[PDB]
């Protein structure tokens, strides 16, 4: 099913599958402690996860997997996926993180700041490269399919790798359409995929920092890494 889509069809499918941008409960007239600010972000992330699960079902190839494997991929990738979403919507806000339209923070707000600086650095990197929305949705789907694929039957993994190859084809298609030379296409492909190593790093360092009120869903997503 996923293997028959053209590049343009794949891009359209991913764009249409995009989750909405959710609001936080931040109130500028209310004082917040470190505890209550974490509460805001927990509340936000928890609601985002529900939309992420439904988004995942619309990523071409994902529904072809067993429930147990779908669970594993989302357990592995969810924080990376929240993070790349955060970095994407923060791109046009130099020095700040746009957690929600009503929650824009810079680094002197924190207590964590290590993770914040890394997220800021990633956003800056995206901005410099002029990352496109079509490229972003390809990268986000690569994370979902890739992050858990080496920690899982062998057929299930081969199918994931086939879908990942198609997403690579789609990225190259987009870059060729933007007029990049073949050398520029290959270079940009590599630049984008290497940023995924940093997003993995940020996710792991975040968990390490967490070893914060947590929702029932978040708690379960977390134990999967511990």
């Amino acid at each position: 099913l996923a293997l028959s889509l053209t590049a343009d069809q794949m891009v359209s499918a991913l764009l249409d599958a995009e989750p909405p941008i959710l609001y936080s409960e931040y109130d500028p007239t209310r004082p917040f402690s470190e505890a209550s600010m974490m509460g805001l972000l927990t509340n936000l992330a928890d609601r985002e996860l529900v939309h992420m699960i439904n988004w995942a079902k619309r990523v071409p190839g994902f529904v072809d997997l067993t429930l147990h494997d779908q669970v594993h991929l989302l357990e592995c990738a969810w924080l990376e996926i929240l993070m790349i979403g955060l970095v994407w919507r923060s791109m046009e806000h130099p020095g700040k993180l746009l957690f929600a339209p009503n929650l824009l923070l810079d680094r002197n707000q924190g207590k964590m700041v290590e993770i914040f600086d890394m997220l800021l650095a990633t956003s800056s990197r995206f901005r410099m490269m002029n990352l496109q929305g079509e490229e972003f949705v390809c990268l986000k789907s690569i994370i979902l399919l890739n992050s858990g694929v080496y920690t899982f039957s062998l057929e299930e993994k081969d199918h994931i790798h086939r879908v990942l190859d198609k997403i690579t084809d789609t990225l190259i298609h987009l870059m060729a359409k933007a007029g990049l030379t073949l050398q520029q296409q290959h270079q940009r492909l590599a630049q984008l995929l290497l940023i995924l190593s940093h997003i993995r790093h940020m996710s792991n360092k975040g968990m390490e920092h967490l070893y914060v009120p947590l929702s029932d869903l978040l708690l379960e997503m977390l134990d999967a890494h511990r």
Partner: peptide
């Protein structure tokens, strides 16, 4: 698991 369930909906 909740993730398990939400996936089935």
């Amino acid at each position: 698991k909740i993730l398990h369930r939400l996936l089935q909906d």
